[model samples]
Target: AELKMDQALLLIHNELLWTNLTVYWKSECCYHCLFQVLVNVPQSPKAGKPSAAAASVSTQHGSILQLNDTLEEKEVCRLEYRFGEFGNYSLLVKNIEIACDLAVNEDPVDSNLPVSIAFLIGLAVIIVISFLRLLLPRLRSVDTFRGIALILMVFVNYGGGKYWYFKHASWNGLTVADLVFPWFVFIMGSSIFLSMTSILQRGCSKFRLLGKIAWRSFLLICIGIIIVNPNYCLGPLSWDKVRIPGVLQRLGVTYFVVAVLELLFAKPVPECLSLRDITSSWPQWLLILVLEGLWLGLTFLLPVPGCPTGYLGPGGIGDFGKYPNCTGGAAGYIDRLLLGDDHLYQHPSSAVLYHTEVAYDPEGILGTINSIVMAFLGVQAGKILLYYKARTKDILIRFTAWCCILGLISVALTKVSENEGFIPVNKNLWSLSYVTTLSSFAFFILLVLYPVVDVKGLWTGTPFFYPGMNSILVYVGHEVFENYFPFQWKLKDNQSHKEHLTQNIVATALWVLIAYILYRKKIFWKI
Candidate 1:
């Protein structure tokens, strides 16, 4: 066999990869001829794994024809099929673009430990606080429950329980990581009424209160732009290329709109702290229903210039490439048109799994509407607390009832299975089903925690409470100092999920430690 085609054609197989290419060499000289694939042409390599951005494939001594990884669209993958065992071997490659489907038979990531372990740890804390309060009669909780979630957020941010479930469901399904952000938004909604109720109780003017709401919303969006852009490395010019919609930005927007709704209904009517209060807010409920209808109508009816109305399928091989450019379909179209491709999230959560060619931001302009719906559910929780005036048993019953209602919605949307369900619980899509599932769980958590923390008066808040109280600082600090030492460092082998998991836990623990010190000093940030 002879070779002659520049120093680095490296099999010249883009189209070849999509099909079948087989080359068999007969060893006529008695000794088996060795074959090898390389990252670059020579010793001073010019590339990386086949997954490298510039190159095509992974080349190892004996693995060139064995690579089945299809994670990214393009990469520099090199495989060198060294002459192992010196025998006639038939080289076989299924599909060169190893799709997310390859992961179907593989063992699913085990996140049970993280959840169970976290539950045990948080439960122990609850028991200790309950005992402490019994002893001192003044230990607290509630905010500590948030602290547990925050610390749990840290675990998930690090890698969730295990490495697999945290990076978002391939296309559908829910994970621990998926549960936290909406939990964060829900908490924000709960606090909205709790905190705003305090201000209104002092006879604060609604007109001035609206101004503060606007200011806070502006600051949140600004912080997302300035501090936590994720595209922070490109200097000031990065802002232009940066994906604008973000966690903080979404939080701020939802908070502002929900706050306005609360203001409108909060004080206009008589301050009757009874179940009767809900009956009086007919006009306000109508507005919420109308907004929900709008979200559903637009999601289901809006059509892009090049796509079908209500197209929910991911582009590329997902629907057999019928809607390849459709990407997120209508939502993807909206962000590309309104925010431009540069402003939306560059890497969609479904990119690898669904093989989407175009970027589809989960936090795009369209999904934010449902985000508002989720937050309003939290508003309802606040309304319940306010209207009922802390009748614990009644609060628990009503909260449980909301959970049942939301759960039923999830069943109708998702239909139980991950992909076969009508809507499926997709965090990337932030679909209606996704919001309902998370909101139901949120209601359940509050229901469980309320009796333990507020009604029983057992546990005094500790580690989680400290971090929960100083949540804004904790969140922003983690984002800003993420690459710094203690939070992260250059590991010997960055590929080790164990090492990654450890680093994430350590980093979260350190944040809790910092929060504990703040609590000692009685320092709390209010923004």
Candidate 2:
């Protein structure tokens, strides 16, 4: 067992004993016995400072507090304090018997309760609005859906009110930040079909269209490499340390794969179609399944020199730090080998809480396979739209079926647990369960939105509609000009959640307003 003492605020009776008293751990091992203690020979009041600097003491095995150098007087306090991971506590030493008491401090994690409550209230309001709108009229477009993703993306990018739930998960499980990217990719798949169909109908040759797709994909990759380089702000681009795999890079590659696949099997939407539309795309389905099979095989079967096979847990302080260097296991190893460690994402989400050192990119080589699968799932959505056409009931039924099927797949993989599941829903590795779960959510969102916005004609898909129409512009703009005026400013209280939330909301609103104005002026930055 281990104990991480985070800032032990020492006190004697009602008086301050030591502002920040850090324990020094010492271990003793014999042939048959093992002993450990925090032996601190210093007890001078002159050592006490007015301001306490943060200090931590990690003790392995059991521990006792020895006031002096002698081991005989080691029974000062039988510290049986149950301090959980990342928990805050205070240590009080009474003047009567020198007893130590560990009391709980105001925890940051608990602060999430208010944020969660507010989020649920907002979600409930949206659900109510959807129900009310459903009773009125029917209408719809993917632009509004994309706008939703883009605006949220911008919001979370601006720091999501500094809340943990708004941030990416450390390793496994989902977060609000995790949902937007996949939804954007899914919508990209839907848009590809709609646009390609329009282009083909306009007498555009397949060869010409293929060239356009290649160009667009290439441009996106270039933009991710050159324009969106986070390190650019620090200094000139250092070739040796430049991160290779990124959000736009992965999107570009996924787009190429899915678009090419769709183009290969491109056929004009039939004037009349039967219920066999799902089965008609068997070839594409086979390829997607095969790709998925490859991912599963590589993820489970590939073994690193030191790491265990199929190790999905975030390495470093996680899993008892047994596999410290095996951050992403096979996925990490592959990127380190192919792209080199210097070229990968330096700060992974696992590094946040897990205290990892390995450079593991979320948008790496191995995860791209699953990303393609995700986009293909989106492609299926597009196909459903085209094949079903104005058959609203059929479309809704098909969407419901897909959602149920994907959700069942997720349930089987995750077993309804966060970390204990067979395959945890991890965004870092873009695990299969994560894709299915998010895809299921995407289908459900479309199912609800399509009816209210398109078929019923109740909502106009406002603010989100504008940003969605010019998503690339808004996303790139949000990233490029994130620190500029109207987006960010010096806060009076940096630690205040209210201040952070206001700043983030205002920034996101400005972007949406800009998108709306761009829409009014008929300006869209398309690749």
Candidate 3:
């Protein structure tokens, strides 16, 4: 081994929660090229400074480097890393000794929230809300359905108390959290059609509708960029510092594009719009197919410059040096080109488990095509409601049919496995299988909710419908005041998941209470 002014990892597995730790440094030298090793880690002041015992072997010391480190959300450590002349600088972390006393609680969550069962309570709320929606007379059940999804979302956002269920699958599976967003999007698509029906019936021109749609889309994007952006009062604002892609940004773009599709193909006569009318609008379907084809083509065929074509796996641990810079294949590359490296997301969902070197945005540009496709499928749900009218049997039958079709599509894409499948069911990329899989679930949810809420009146809109009726407010309010009081408070023992879960639950409940109060006041933020 050539032991020069070495740059080599002396320790492969370096992460540990240590209550007490000590280190004695030594090295074997074969060249005159010097190296310095410094550590900047979170520490308690009770521990004071590290007492370094000079070993009788060989030790190299150079610069004191301050790294991005913090303790108790406090000031970062006092250390600095200065670059030296070439071959005159390196950090060979020779050893780490840890006395870790971190306690792990078996049951972190005080109450476990199941994916399906807890939502029966949601159905109860929807039942209450559905009664209110009866006067609208068009897309009757959409608000109720949207409420169901939103309440479920609130639950899961609180459900993650160091629980994997609320989090995304480690790499290639579905979780409760993964199911919520697509459901929201699907419901939005259905709402578009039903609302369009009402508007067209009221003689609102397509041009006027497009203008309204454009206004709303522009508003959503502005809200996403200005209000929902995580950078609040940090420092000076610049393009490099601000994250361009966001939750509402994706929603805004998808909403505009989907609206465009609906405006183009939607039949003027409401009652005459049956399956035949939809089938006759085959050109719209052709355009959708072409968009999907472009997604596939770019995803697989586009050269990522530094990475291999069709490379989907996270780059750090799986792939070797053949694609060192490629973390998310084409999805990341496109964003990196358009939005500079400084502007993209640094903490991706896959960064931890996948051990990625580069940060990749889950809602990146390349993935937006599939997101549009997913919304288009939702548009189909709207059509089903339109064609079926008030016939419960026809509506249920169509919902089931679409479910079966989407189920087949998912099976073909993923083969019901994780990474072993041809195309893994990845929420991060919002893959093709993700569309089918979630859309299938969406259809089933709607089928069950439709009768109970809209038709049979089994249950009326309850607490959830209150929040659902004011979704934009509930969502944006939650994001803006995420870490503030009543929502969240200072923790005595911040390390405990139980405490964290308590905060998450209380915060969620506070928002619901706010929504409820707003509902009682008859105030709703429509946009």
Candidate 4:
């Protein structure tokens, strides 16, 4: 282990029409710092000896294989495939015309059956409980949605059964883990309108409210940086590598912006407002549009040296190793420039699939613009609730309409495809499409949940409702006490997903139980 050389071996079997084909590659790999490396290229034989019939090559994970003619004059195909560390792979090509379709064969190591089985079992339990609760006494409340998002957030944070889908997406696209934070942000936005409206109605001064908001945001940022830091295990907490952007930090900043925006332009909703009342908030909408425009402008137009313009692909082996240093495009550049790479998230989800090396924070500065936008969208939902307070049908109708509109925008931006559209629905960059897509899902979820829990009152939103009531406490406590006994323990089989899933579920359930006990005692932690 003198030097851990992460490497792979490639055996290319040539079955093409042309007997002699040349293959060369270039890969940018990092031992400690980012640097370029060259892959296999045939050398001139000594004593006029002919080269071997097939080529056996060894290269790094993110190599760009360039297939050229024997004379090295014209290129036939260029391929970039992620060969696992210490992996042996076989590449076969039957036709030169379709050389890009080279069949790569390797033995699969991990099975996802454990995750699937656990999900089905969890779903069945939820169904049975919901059914039993439906038969019990009904309780009317609209805040159950918060519980829905919070419980899932806790589970995913605990490990999500060690499943890929339960985790955040590698770069682009949605995962069960990705849905919770934005939903939490969205709920915060909705809660902001409702709570602020109530407080303002009681004749609270705007300046006083602003001061409260500022203080709360500062405390949240401090807690995120100091108490619940990811770098604690690295050593004593130092300024050298402590991450600046985080879930709570982003939440704090987003709350300040959205709340201030609403405080400035929010008008009292008339007792009998119509659907046309949406147009009354034109000023707020205009600012939101400008903010989104700024995000788009900077994301696509900013030029970073050594990277393609508007490059959004994860760096390392992504994009066929074309832009290995251009992870997160302008967003990553801005964070590295403004916040310093040491202060940003050291390990991003993209590192798992793309083998990215450069540090990229998912909750970085640029993405906060969209975070505010997502919250603003949630504010829209709250406005509908206030406007149609007595009109359940109208409220449901408007929620459905917003969902359809946002979903359509997402479709246009993403083309209903992952990683292939104009702007992929990426959580890493917090791309515009991501905000729209999550907002659409938010609206749809509210549409289904609001009437079920608040209007008809069939269920009490048990378990989830408990954690939802004390979300901040649950989130912070779970993170702070994660390593303590009862929450975590030694596993017999380290690679067994069943054991991992069981641990995560038990930990999550314990938090729920704690929250339930806190609720019984009327002990709520509010920040």
Candidate 5:
């Protein structure tokens, strides 16, 4: 009887130890082991106590253990155990039975129906308006209407859609709306090109041009920083950690580069100069080559200060170096070293979030080199448009073909480089490959639009023309609306409905109506 009791107590202890230490492996294993111990316990039968010899037990694991004892005093057996494995370890005990439960998986949520429908409707409106803007010169007044429509488009994209859909909807695929933001940037570039030409043609002094550029750059950078964090401040004589380069920063830099290029390479050839004369003028290409060489050379030669020697590897010299001074390697390091915590840091890839926790090196200094290249590419495109006076169909074909070839080549090159982990094609880094790819897309879209709008003379009911005309106003105003008015309204728990119908679509329609009315009055906004 003593030996039987001892064996029963030992089995109970082993079961307890196993439960506390090994139950985390699999739910089935845990359940099986636990049930085995529970069934083996002897039952009392006389009024309350029975002969241990008559009891029979079975376990879920199909393991059986039996004991027969005649002693009257209860053993009161108790056991405890805990277990952990791999890096993910946890303690569990067998004495306290715990049941594991699994629930049915839910389907991914869909975006709001009204918002989706509204966006589609807006897109149709834009396409129609864009086509119309291309057709009629007499209705140039409709350009203002187009501009207003663009403002509404931007408001919908940046304010309403971004606020509601992105925040709440589980739809992860890239949509046509994603292209709108970059389209704004491209339009800005185009406007700069056109306006700069006019400024230079008017014989504006370089100093004045520089001053305007400086003021605009300062304002844009300040606005970007403030948008990220309104509470950002710098202590007296102290630095603040702000993101170095951003969308606005890129715009400012591109403007500066364009201005410089105009000063250096935009000299008009004599009217009588032959094709040979223009071809022989190597200075412009030479200047571009020199800039590229200098930028590449700097990137390879400079070392990041704090990082280990091999941190960036062979290609990691300029911004890719380990030091905070290096532009490409880590943006936050530089920001902290130069500016401190008071400055704002924005994620390079995601424009909406603040880089408060992780050091986001968006448009890091190294990334600027690629941006310059992108701007130069834009300059080349602009030059092509300015010089090539082919028939509209011929121009369209050539533009389309060039964009396709360049885009394909860039995509291939970026993919190869990315796989090798050499020069990662990170959008935030704005690697050369990324710049080339995005520029190709930009060129492709521009080529498609140019002939339709600039040559075909189609000015129809398309709403895109509104924002397309005064893109800057649309961009700045959209930003203000988002920051101040913010169009978000909560509908239910964990869900919110963005008031897109009221704030964006309707507001834009009104603006377009006003512009159309003004167009009839022969009023235009020009720089």
Candidate 6:
């Protein structure tokens, strides 16, 4: 009978190929111990017989030898060894199943109570404020306070603040950091909407608007790369990998696409047409179908220069891949051919088109095309917003319906494409399906929140609204602050104290409070 269990090891062996394998045993037996060997021999004369295996032991060397026993019958040998030695020793068993159970002592892990408490507090504050803003109206204001709060939330959620706090923490784990890149995409869409609306209101010409959009997009993409790799020292900067299709880069791409769509497809109705009329228009729906169809067809048929399986249209795979043979395309092979080693920027080039397996290519060339669709989605959202200005109930319903429709379509496409292994939906690539699905969901969230907060003015205690107002300023400010003061404390143990949840909350709170004071003083920062 097994008493209080102490140690155990379960072992199983397949067919043995050869004999003459040595069996080694070494152990300091200090307590009552049992060694059992169960063998299953299929082809043997004593296969069904049970035999008592003889054992010869040497006390000095602590060695044992079983004599006159063939590996014939499946035998179970049990031996009792008394506890004599108090130390540890190794035991080896060969050509049989041996199971052992051992008892050992272990130490407990240290609790990060302070960090946990701080996190709970910050999370509670964010959730409470988010809920209150949704529930109340008087707390809503488009000032610096709201802007600062929004910025702080973004930094905290993005892991920028968290990285500052936990300097040694690995970025590979699953955390709130995963949500930031998607949120950045959403912000890009939002910025495009706001910028486009402003441009339209200013009655800018298509040519002038497109030129500005191009310059801005080019500058943003370049600036994003520069900021991530300032010194261009390949060592530190190499890790940065300044993706070609980043947040700002995507924003620029989307801006151009949406602007073009608006110019080419958006119906120029009478200037005095009411929101109701535009909302119910069939032309908008037609435009959407046309754009989606055109995009799908082009992506499928365009043969990428290096990608033998893609389409061959104007801005097709060949053009974007920058393959030397990509003639009659937007990006000629000659241009890419000229870059040579410089083209090793991880984007889809003639050399590295499909090299990036599942990883998202922030600067991937094919991803840029996908971003255009995301921008178009933003444009579509803007159109919806303009149409449903007065009809809040209908706006909500329609927005939800569109999101569901787009989401389902995207999911279906993703499944089909993934199975085919043709156009893999890499988030970094901004795979068309990824853009559609993510943007659809993002739009749904924005639709639900923007109306209540920005339109109906139903914000309550949520400080997120404050930072949301001056988002750009908050972004730049937070970046500068984090870079300047990387750490805030020094431990008595001479260890550097990076930020923690407490420090993050306090820092964010201080920023928001200052912003609130500035709001009261009627100070605003805008770009």
Best by TM-score: 2
At residue 34, give the lDDT of candidate 6: 21
Taking all chains together, the TM-score of candidate 1 against the true structure is 0.75
Better of 1 and 3 by lDDT: 3
lDDT by residue (tens digit), candidate 4, 109-149: 33456667777998999899778977992222445788878
C-alpha TM-scores of all predictions = 0.75, 0.81, 0.73, 0.80, 0.58, 0.54
In model 4, which range of ten residues has the least summed lDDT?
Answer: 30-39
- The TM-score between candidate 4 and the true structure equals 0.80
Tens-digit per-residue lDDT, 419-462, candidate 6: 23333343433445666666776656666676666667655425
- Model 5 misplaced regions, further than 4 Å: 1-109, 112-186, 199-246, 269-302, 305-356, 416-422, 459-461, 483-527
- lDDT value for candidate 4? 0.78
Whole-model lDDT for model 3 versus the true structure?
A: 0.66
lDDT of each: 0.66, 0.76, 0.66, 0.78, 0.43, 0.44
Better of 2 and 3 by TM-score: 2
Order of the predicted models by TM-score, top scorer first: 2, 4, 1, 3, 5, 6
Q: Which candidate is the best by lDDT?
A: 4
Give the root-mean-square deviation of each candidate in angstroms.
Answer: 10.9, 7.2, 12.8, 6.3, 15.1, 14.6
Query: Per-residue alpha-carbon lDDT of model 5 for 34-123, expressed as tens digits?
Result: 112232333332332321221111111122222112143322232232211111111111234432221212221233455777778868
What is the C-alpha lDDT profile of model 2 across 52-130, one tens digit per residue? 3232332212223333224344445445432233445555554455555656673423334446666687789889988
In model 6, state the lDDT of residue 485.
Answer: 43
In candidate 4, list every pair of residues with a backbone clash. none
Give candidate 1's root-mean-square deviation (CA, Å).
10.9
